[PDB]
Design a protein around this ligand. Sequence first.
Ligand SMILES: Cn1ccc(CNCCc2ccccc2)n1
Ligand SMILES: Cn1ccc(CNCCc2ccccc2)n1
Ligand SMILES: [Mg+2]
Ligand SMILES: [Mg+2]
Lengths: 546, 546
Amino acid sequence: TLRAAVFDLDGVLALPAVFGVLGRTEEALALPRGLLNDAFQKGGPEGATTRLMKGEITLSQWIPLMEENCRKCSETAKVCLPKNFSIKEIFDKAISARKINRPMLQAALMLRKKGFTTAILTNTWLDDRAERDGLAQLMCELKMHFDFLIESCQVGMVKPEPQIYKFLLDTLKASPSEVVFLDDIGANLKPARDLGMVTILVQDTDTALKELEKVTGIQLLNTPAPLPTSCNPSDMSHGYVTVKPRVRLHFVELGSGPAVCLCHGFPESWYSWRYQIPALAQAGYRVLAMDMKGYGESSAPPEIEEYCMEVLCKEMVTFLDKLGLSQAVFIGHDWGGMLVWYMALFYPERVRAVASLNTPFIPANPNMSPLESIKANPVFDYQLYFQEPGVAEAELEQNLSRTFKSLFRASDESVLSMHKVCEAGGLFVNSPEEPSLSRMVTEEEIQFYVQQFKKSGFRGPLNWYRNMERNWKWACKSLGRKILIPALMVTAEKDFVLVPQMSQHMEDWIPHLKRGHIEDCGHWTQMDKPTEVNQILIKWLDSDAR
Amino acid sequence: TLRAAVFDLDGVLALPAVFGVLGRTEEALALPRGLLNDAFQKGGPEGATTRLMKGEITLSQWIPLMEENCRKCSETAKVCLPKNFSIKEIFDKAISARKINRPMLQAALMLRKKGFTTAILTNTWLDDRAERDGLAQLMCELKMHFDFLIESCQVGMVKPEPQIYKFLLDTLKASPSEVVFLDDIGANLKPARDLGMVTILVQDTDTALKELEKVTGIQLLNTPAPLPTSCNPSDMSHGYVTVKPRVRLHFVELGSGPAVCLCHGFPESWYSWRYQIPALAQAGYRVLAMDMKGYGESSAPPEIEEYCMEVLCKEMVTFLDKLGLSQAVFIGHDWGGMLVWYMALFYPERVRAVASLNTPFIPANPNMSPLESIKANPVFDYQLYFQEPGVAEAELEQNLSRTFKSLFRASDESVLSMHKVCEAGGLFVNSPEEPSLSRMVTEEEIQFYVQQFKKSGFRGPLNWYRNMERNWKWACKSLGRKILIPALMVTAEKDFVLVPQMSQHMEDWIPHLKRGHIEDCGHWTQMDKPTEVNQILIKWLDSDAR
Ligand SMILES: Cn1ccc(CNCCc2ccccc2)n1
Ligand SMILES: Cn1ccc(CNCCc2ccccc2)n1
Ligand SMILES: [Mg+2]
Ligand SMILES: [Mg+2]
C-alpha cells in the first residue's frame, strides 16, 4: 500500500531546526518568551516571512524586514533588544549549526532501496548571503539521495497551503493513501492528513522512525551499517584528454578542491573506485578517477612498450598538463599503486602527495634480473603465465562474466590459488564454469566490468606485466633517491599476492611514510572494505595533502 | 637556413637566475666573494650538484650536501657562516623570485609562429620541496609554448657534456647549423658552437634579442602586443554530463581553483572563449567553457520549450549537481549573459558571482507583452524574423562559412544592418556571397564553427529566441527581488544590438553592481578585444569571487 515517503528538511532531515534558534536566542538573551517567533511570523500569509518562503524576496532582502518586526514586537511588549542584537548574525549561526540528521537520511535511503519514491518538501528561501555556500553544500548532499526536492521558494507555494500538497501528489504520481509524510510542525501535517496521507509528527528522531517502521513494515532502526554511496556511471561527468596522437585517457570527475587522481589496478576500471568517489568529493576534494591506459574508455594500443612505467607516467604528466593542473594527489591500487610510487620518484613537483593501497614500494635490485626475482616467489607464478602474448588474453577473454566473478572475491571466498598457474595451464583451470556471486559485488556491477572489457579485452591490461626488464632499467635510475613528499602505504591483511610484509622495509626509502592497515581485507581493497578505505584516505588527505 | 631555436630556463626564459642568488647572498651577508659558488660547484663532474642536475638525487637530499660544502669552503677560507645561515631558505626565496622573462618568451612564441621548432634545454633538478608547486606552475606555463622541453635531471645528462647536445640535435631532427642556441653561461655554449650551432650569450635580454633578430632575419624586438594564448580544441580536456535523459552538456575544462562557468551567446560555441580559457586558468581558476544546449557537442532537442530560460537554468543547476560543485562563478555573453542573470535571481546559492558581457539585466515589464517591447526597438527586428520555425534555419544553414564570416565582424567591418530584416526577407539579403575574412578571425577558426554547426544546425540555437512569452512569465516571478551577490556588467561601446545605454538602470536591481566598459568593441566581445576582456574579468574575479 505505502509507496512514497516525504520528508521535511528543517527538523526532520536536518538538525537543529532554525525556529529552534528563535527559541534558543530568546532564552540565551533573556527576551520575552516567543518574541522572536512573533516577529518571525508577523503578518501571517501576508508577512515578510511568507514572501520569503514563496520566493518573492531573497533572504538578504528579508533580514531588515525581520529586524523591523523584532523592533515592533519589543515595543508592544515594552522591552528592549540588547545592543548588537543581530538577525543576520543569529541566522548565519543557526544555518551553519544545522547538519544532516544521519539516521533520518539512512531511513530515507533504505525506503528508497525497497522501492519507495522519496521526496523532500520544504519551506525554504532564496539564499543570497555571503555564507550561502554552506546551505548549497547541505542541499547538494541531501538531494542526490531523493527522487524529488520541492522547495517552497521555487514553486511559489508554502506549507500549510493546500495547493502545495496537491502539487506534491502530482509530482509523486501517487494517491494520498500511498504516501507517508514526516514533519516536525503539526499544522503542516493537517492538510496531508485531510487528503488521507499517513503522517508522522517528528519530535525525537528514534520515535518518528519507530512510527515510520511500524507503518511501512520495513526495518529502519538498529539496522546494520550501510555501505558508502556508490556511483551511477551515467550520472557522472565523463572527461577525455588526448595525451598523444593515438592515446586519449578517459576519467570520471566529481567534487571541487585539491585534485585527487585515482589509479586502479589489474584488471579493473575507474569504477573500482565507485565507493571512494562520492566520499572523497564530499570530504572537500576534486576527484579524477581514471580508466588507466589499456582500459574501459581509454585508448588501448596493442604494443607492449606502450605500457612500460616510463611511458605510462609521462602520459599521466601530460594528462595533468592538458587539464592545466600543476599537481595532483596520486592514489593508486595494485598496478596503479606501482605507478604512483614512480610518479613520486620521477615527477615529485607534480605530485602533491602519494598513496598506495596494497602495492609496496620496493627499489629495483640492480643485481638481479626482474624475471629471476619473480621466479623466486611462487605466488607470482601467474606473472610468468602472463608473459607470452595471446595466451592469458584467450583465457581471460573467453568468458568475461566468469573472469570477473572468479577474480573479484573476498578473502574467505576464493576459487583460484595463484599456485603453479603455468604448470596447471591457466588461471582458471580449477575454477567453476559459473562461479557464485561474491558478497562484494552485484550481478549488475559484474556486468559493468564485462561491458567495459568488451571494448578492448585484455591485451593492453596484460601488457602492464610485459615490461619487467624495461621497468627495472628505468627504476635503476632512481636508486639514489628517497621519496620525501607526503606518502601513505595501506596494507591489506589478507591480500595473498601483495602481502603486508612485502612493505616492511619501505621506511628505508620513504622515512616519513605514514601507514594504514585493513584487517580481514583481501586484494580488491576498495570494494572489500570501502568504509575503512574511505576513513583512512580522508584522514590522511586532511592532514597531509591539504 | 636557421630552423630551430633553443632556450635555457635559468637566466634566459626565467629571471633572476638562481646562481645570481649565490652572488647576491654573498654580498648581502658580507661573505668572501664566490664562497657560495665554490660550494655549489664543489667536486665538479662528481660533486653533489652534478648528481642533482642528473636526477641521481632529489633537491631535498641535495640541500644538506650543499650545506656541508658551504661549511668546508668557509673553513678553508678561515671565515664563519652567520647564525641562521640557511641553504633551504636561500633557495626557496631564489626559486620563488624567479619569473618568466616575458620578452624572451614572446620572441620564442614569434619564432615558433614563423615555423621554427623551439625547445627548452635546461640543467634542472627533481624538486621535492614543500614549496615545489611554484616551480611546477612556472614549468607548466612555459612548456606549453615549446616543441620540446629537455631537462637534465630527466635525461641523465647535463650541459656542458657533449652527449646532451647530441641528444638535443636528435630530438630536434635538425643539423647543428640549422639551430640557434641561447644561454647565459659561455661554457654551456661552447659545445654547441663546436658542432657549428649559432649561439647567443645572453646577458641583458634586449641585446640577446637583437642578436637573435639579426641572425634569424625575423623581427622580435618592438613588435606589436601579441594576442593572448588561444586554445587548440584537440589539446583540451573535453567533459560530458547528462543532465536528463535526452540532454547531455559538453564543456571544455582547464585550470584548478574556484569553478568559473563560461556561457556563450548566439550563434556561438565554447570556442568563443578560446582567448579567455588559458588566461583565466593561468590566473588561478577552474574554467568550464560550455557548449550551451543547442550547440556543438551538447544535445540539441528540436522542441521550442526545451530552450526556455527556466529549463535551461534548471539544467545548469543539475550540471553543477552531477559535477559535485556547490557553486560556480557564472560568466555569460549575449544569450549566455541573459542566462547567468537568471541563475543569479533564481539560484543565488549556486552562483559564487555573476558577470555578463554586453547583455544587460532588465526586469520583465509585467504591463507589456514581450513581443510588443521587441516591436518598439527597430534593432530587434531580426528577433521577429527568428520567430517562425524553419525560416531563419534555412537561411543560416544554407552556407555556414558565409553565415559565420558575415556575423563575426569587428565594428568597422560590418556587412549586415539589423535593419528591417523581416521586410528585406532575411538577415543576409544584402550581404555578399563570399564575405572577406574579418581581422578578428582566421579561416581556420571560421571552419571550426562551420564544423560544429554541421552537427545540429540552427534549430536549437534559434529556439533560444522562441520563448519570449514563457521567459517573460517566469521572469515576472522575480520582480520583487534584487541581485545582491557579487555582479559585474561589461558594456561594449560599439555593440549596436546590445548597446551600453540599455544597461543604464541596472543599479536599481543590483545596487552593488561593478562595471567595466570596452571602447571600440563590437558585439563579439571576447574575440574583438580579448586582451581587455581578460584584464577586466581577472581583476574582478580576484577582488569579488575569490
Ligand atoms: C608488480 N605488481 C603490480 C601489481 C601486482 C599484483 N597484480 C595482481 C592482480 C591479479 C589479481 C588476481 C589474479 C591475477 C592477478 N604485481
Ligand atoms: C534578448 N537577447 C539576448 C541576446 C540578444 C542579442 N542576440 C544577438 C545575436 C545576433 C548577432 C548578430 C546578428 C544576429 C543575432 N538579445
Ligand atoms: Mg520544519
Ligand atoms: Mg643558465
